[PDB]
Design a protein around this ligand. Sequence first.
Ligand code: NI
Length: 341
Amino acid sequence: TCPFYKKIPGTGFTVDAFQYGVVEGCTAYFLTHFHSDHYAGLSKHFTFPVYCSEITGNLLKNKLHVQEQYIHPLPLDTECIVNGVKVVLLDANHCPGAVMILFYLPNGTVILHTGDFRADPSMERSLLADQKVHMLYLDTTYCSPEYTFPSQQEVIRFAINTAFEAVTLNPHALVVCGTYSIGKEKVFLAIADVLGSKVGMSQEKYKTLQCLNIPEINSLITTDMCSSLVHLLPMMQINFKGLQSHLKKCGGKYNQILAFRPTGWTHSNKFTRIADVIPQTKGNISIYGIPYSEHSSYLEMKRFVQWLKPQKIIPTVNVGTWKSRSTMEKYFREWKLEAGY
Ligand code: NI
């Protein structure tokens, strides 16, 4: 049964609730972004409206095969009427096509649902700047002060440098990058760019990328592996047994792999900076973990919520245990008392 934090009061709207069957009363099913926890349940056989971004729509049509009539894409940053309710989509700074949604209720209440987001100061000069927000459905993935990580730009610096070093030292080395969903495209796009290559990938992954409206994308990616010295692989596959295996397949064209595993937080964030990172090493294969996050750090989340001064906050992540819920409320109280709302 659909949980209360997936429903919007005073509407027939639900958010990211596709895995329950029909929700009685639900006229519209919003999808924040194309990640399988949030979309679990959609197929070709959905005959209710879905509202989502254009990019999310392309992925629904081409990867799950939903029928063009039932996909209502909406532009961002545009006041749009949806069954006589004003809504806006705003960029969530998560993965491609990920949005937050502003709901303007008839009674005067305003609700922001962040889906998955990485809070950023540029959001403070968006449409949100213009009016008060009474309720906040918040991505709480990293709502605990231990969760720090660097800026995406810091991380992209590290990567561009590492890769470019090795390839210039050894011109027969291959860069690999791990992946299992959309998100984090800037890692491989940046590396390839510095190396003067295209990124090479399987057919399915090429298909997923061609739906994302990246400009000039035809110049940046290929399905021809031979022709490319930045490869993508399944994140399952990024290990010594699977990388050795893959190094076979290239047929003596490269004598060294240098992989990157973009991860979120790991406990080695607690004691080690980005400029002081190292890889595991079993012979000629070197696997880097790099904490490129597409979720808010604790500080980033803290600032956003302290600027927004919501009258009420509804967690959407880590809500499944009483301890997590309790720990989160405490932080919400501190923020509110610090900030005087
Ligand atoms: Ni996500």
